[PDB]
Amino acid sequence: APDTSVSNKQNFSTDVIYQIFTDRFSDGNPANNPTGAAFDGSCTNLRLYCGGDWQGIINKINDGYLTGMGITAIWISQPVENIYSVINYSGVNNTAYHGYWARDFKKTNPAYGTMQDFKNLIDTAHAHNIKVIIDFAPNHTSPASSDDPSFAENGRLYDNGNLLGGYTNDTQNLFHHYGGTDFSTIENGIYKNLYDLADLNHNNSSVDVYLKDAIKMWLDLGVDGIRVDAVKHMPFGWQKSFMATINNYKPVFTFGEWFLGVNEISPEYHQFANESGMSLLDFRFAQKARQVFRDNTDNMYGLKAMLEGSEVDYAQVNDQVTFIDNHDMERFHTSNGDRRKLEQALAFTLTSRGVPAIYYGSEQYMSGGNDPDNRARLPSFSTTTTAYQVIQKLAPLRKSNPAIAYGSTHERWINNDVIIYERKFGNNVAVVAINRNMNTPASITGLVTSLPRGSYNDVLGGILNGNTLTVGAGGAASNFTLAPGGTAVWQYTTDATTPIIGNVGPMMAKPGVTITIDGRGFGSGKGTVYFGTTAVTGADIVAWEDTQIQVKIPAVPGGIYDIRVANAAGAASNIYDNFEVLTGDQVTVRFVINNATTALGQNVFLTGNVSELGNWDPNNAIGPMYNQVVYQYPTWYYDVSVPAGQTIEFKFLKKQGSTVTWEGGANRTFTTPTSGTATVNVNWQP
Amino acid sequence: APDTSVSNKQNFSTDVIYQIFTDRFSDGNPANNPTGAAFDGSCTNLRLYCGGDWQGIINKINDGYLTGMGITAIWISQPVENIYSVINYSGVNNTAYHGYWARDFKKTNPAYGTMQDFKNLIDTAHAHNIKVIIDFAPNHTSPASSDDPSFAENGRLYDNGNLLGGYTNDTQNLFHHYGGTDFSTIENGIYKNLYDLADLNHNNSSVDVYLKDAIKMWLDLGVDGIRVDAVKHMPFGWQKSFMATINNYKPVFTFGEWFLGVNEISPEYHQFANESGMSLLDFRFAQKARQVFRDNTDNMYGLKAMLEGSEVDYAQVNDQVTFIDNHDMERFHTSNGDRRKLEQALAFTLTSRGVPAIYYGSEQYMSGGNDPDNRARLPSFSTTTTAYQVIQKLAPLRKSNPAIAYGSTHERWINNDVIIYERKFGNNVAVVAINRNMNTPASITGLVTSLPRGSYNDVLGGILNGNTLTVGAGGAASNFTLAPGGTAVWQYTTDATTPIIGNVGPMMAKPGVTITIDGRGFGSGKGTVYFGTTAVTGADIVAWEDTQIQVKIPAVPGGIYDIRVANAAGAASNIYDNFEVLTGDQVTVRFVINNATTALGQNVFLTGNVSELGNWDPNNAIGPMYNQVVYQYPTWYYDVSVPAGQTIEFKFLKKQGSTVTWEGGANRTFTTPTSGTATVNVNWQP
């Protein structure tokens, strides 16, 4: 099937995501509305249920509101049954309208709909070529107090109606009981509770298996993507075994939320995007885009530096989900802010690298502060706003122009207020020019592009005051004045003769899994896929066509491989690196080491004989291990994804700067479980 | 030996070449000076001999003039015996002072020195770590008139004293007798005479073998590089067999001259750089640098487009020889024009990609128009000009900082008069800021670089009004004013932990030849070199150290290969592409096809079964063939380098866009000569 197909659940760069708070979009079925204290039909108390549901989204796909805008994927609230309690927090009543307070991950939230309503939403979305992404929040169940078991539903977890347990009297340790986080360390934020939310214990085998069975059920119902809540707050080794469960079963595009503030660049955030098996909401993009287009706290050089820097720091930049606002920030459009600012920031996001997400109601110029005020019901379904038309004109280019979906980003002209950038993929080109200054025109002289000679018409049709671009010989444009607030997009597409890989999904899986390689120029006849120097041909290539190849991962040793395609004529593609072949299915094992005393800046790590443990390489060792909450120094601990059902060999080490101190003695051995978790508890061998 | 060693004859990106017109630099031996009418000791008449010789160049290496400037390679006038005639062109007397009128390619020009002086020059240069490049001009001998055999020496060619023949009564057909070129087409400029120079006929086996024995003789005398004259004027297929003779024998850096005018971008020029086996004087760079820093006929946006476009169009941009003026251009500095223009442009060239060449006397601010006025005797040997000091501070960086020798070029800040670019190779960084505006300071706000946080001294120590750069977190530099005319260079080096290939030489040779791979991070232990998927290890790697590997080309089929290095730990490098493995030694064969009538825009091409003939691929066929001068339409002809001593199969095809029309019949076979040339004259087969 081609790369742009709705059946491509693995890669979303050709898509535009519309993020819906299900309760706040459309009430298509009033019979499923919560009653009494839990419901507010006027939606003026934004902490209560207003009535929006899966039938309302079906109705808006059907009548052309969503499809008219060019949307090709929707991201909805977590679908699972939530608690029914109305919680009073300091006067204000609060309900689970947002879908984040789960009680049963195997059932639906009936305010949103039934299992049949969910099936009908999947089938309507697919019939209209829209992919469906669901939130999934495996970190916690709901607000709970173990001291007061009558508060809310005491964080209770059920498995298809069957009670597994609550927070009070948790004799099975389904939950963490360490108090609440103060967010001081990443360790602190993982094992302590977020606010009053009952923290699930993923080291408990019943919790691990339950959540893995639950995600497979939603994959069996046809979902096409997953957005994981609070990835900063769950053990990264458990989330890698969770991603291996998805990828080795039915791989679908998965991304998480790790919040970053203005000007925060975090190593851990970039490591997580690069090594977890999921991508991230691109807060680095979003925060700089709001500084340049909204708050004017940075200029075009800051935007350029973010695009140039992120291209390097994210191993797969085409998988990162970009946005200009969402449920965790003030709405981009403000009361006293010019609407052209929103329109430009949307045109920039839709033409930039990554997978663009638009927060519902952006096209209706909704304004509002932070939660709950950024989640008002959307006030209108007018299809004639400039913002609606901006998305309607640009969002189809992700499907039709491979340069927009996959290309490189090249700054061609810049000054403090103007950027002109080019996206390029093979011979496909798009050029975007943005003047954020609203009172001064920009004189553009000396613009060179990769466009062939011609008079290119602005894809926006002059609605954001764009103009035609005349390109002569050598891609040189004739000079022009870009209007105050001007935004224009120019493009050229052709068929590629060289194979070029634009995206690969999934990025981590065991031998025998089919991955999806998307791009252009592969040709019609089956050629060769290289995983390192290993060639895969014939029957192992499950499908081959010019924009997409599906191929089985060869039985190569676990490790990181470069992927390369050669078409039937032997012409080879660019290399798409950082593919992780797993040793096999994964389980999370907690490694605990006692009596590992360290100096200042010296930390304990783990390594061993499988790729999952760094293959005995100190530079790739697992850690630094943790040593504050579940166990305290000099005992260190860490939850690590490792191959299931096999005897691994390992050793601990201390590292400080360039010095590695290994444990002495014989190498340690451990036979991992086939599913569930296990704990290894040992003592430092000098 | 390391990449920066004087013994690395294959790659010159760590060098700075100083171009010397031997007669116009230093007369170190007055006893070898031409006498009488051929000589002007005062060098007032710039068309006569002034006395400069190889002993004068030895004296300027030994007294510290050249070594003090940081020069690491000299490029001198053609060393071979020239005609002795004083030619009178319309009253003006003229001699071979420039070395371009050869009469014997196997002897030295006596005015420059004996064989002994040449060997002493090689040894003195090498002892002082200077490489030696010679001109070689195999397109012609000298001014000749077949009608008047008494004019000049009638272009006579000798072979070590034995007359091979002259232009009048050329019964052996050593020369072309088609008249002079009008430069209307490439074909016209190849087979007709340049002005009155007796054009050699490379399809004559005596000429072919003589010129290849002559070059081999000079490689045996120890020369380190060859600059070939008039590459646009010899058959490209003969030039490729000549380059293969060099590269399969004693590979040295070879580059040619193909003139480009202002704003001229030629596809044939780039195709020759990429496919001939030699690189080129980078006229594209030179013309744009002059437009921006000398003439003001373009601004920094055009310089940016030149850097960014040349990156892509040259398959190996690190091998192109850059410059701002030379023997075929008016001097960059004008009579009492602003010296800071020259000083900024030299700084620009010394810190940019490729191999920089400085024309002698640039450090003495010599001015003058076109030939012979740009070749005056240099007027001073002062070592205290600002220009001498600029070369001295920046030239060593090509040896010490691999980002300047090999790195990418990245514009980081720009406006009409200011460019700030960054060179990067691994984590080595150099950042250059240039304000060409001589009256307006520039406030640089928003500069982001790859430099670590800290303060950086301008490497030029303020001599071109540069300043200290303070870099904070994120590579963001503090706001500073770049003075009018300000140029500053800031850098950071640190050792490469992983393999990075910066250059490969030669780029075209047969199996068994040793090639030189230069870069950083290869480590001291032998690793693996890949030519495609063919791993080469052990005894086939002739030498391996951290900055340089020498390895023998494996016995793979002829074709274009990617080269990649993996150090002993298995970390792999970037891919260096476009390496051509030849099928074997090369001979040039003339292919002639008669009765090949074509339509509007339909042309004849040759293809065949060796890689040299495109391997039957019509998109890789040799052509379009020629049909004007040696043979006339509908007879087409072409001189093609093919493997020597074997039976090749071939066919002709006609192409008009995408329609390929083949000859009928069984494929033609020919057994190529082992040495010399051959002609295949054949009839179109329907």
Ligand SMILES: OC[C@H]1NC[C@H](O)[C@@H](O)[C@@H]1O
């Ligand atoms: O704090 C990050 C994450 N924690 C849990 C909250 O329920 C969720 O909405 C939030 O986005």
Ligand SMILES: OC[C@H]1NC[C@H](O)[C@@H](O)[C@@H]1O
């Ligand atoms: O000597 C202890 C430690 N040293 C280095 C070896 O690679 C590793 O296998 C061993 O466990």
Ligand SMILES: OC[C@H]1NC[C@H](O)[C@@H](O)[C@@H]1O
């Ligand atoms: O083609 C330019 C070139 N032509 C050939 C001439 O010999 C040389 O003097 C001149 O520089």
Ligand SMILES: OC[C@H]1NC[C@H](O)[C@@H](O)[C@@H]1O
């Ligand atoms: O297709 C015509 C020509 N092409 C290439 C084939 O190898 C040769 O055998 C054939 O005659």
Ligand SMILES: [Ca+2]
């Ligand atoms: Ca409802």
Ligand SMILES: [Ca+2]
């Ligand atoms: Ca947690």
Ligand SMILES: [Ca+2]
């Ligand atoms: Ca002399």
Ligand SMILES: [Ca+2]
């Ligand atoms: Ca010629």
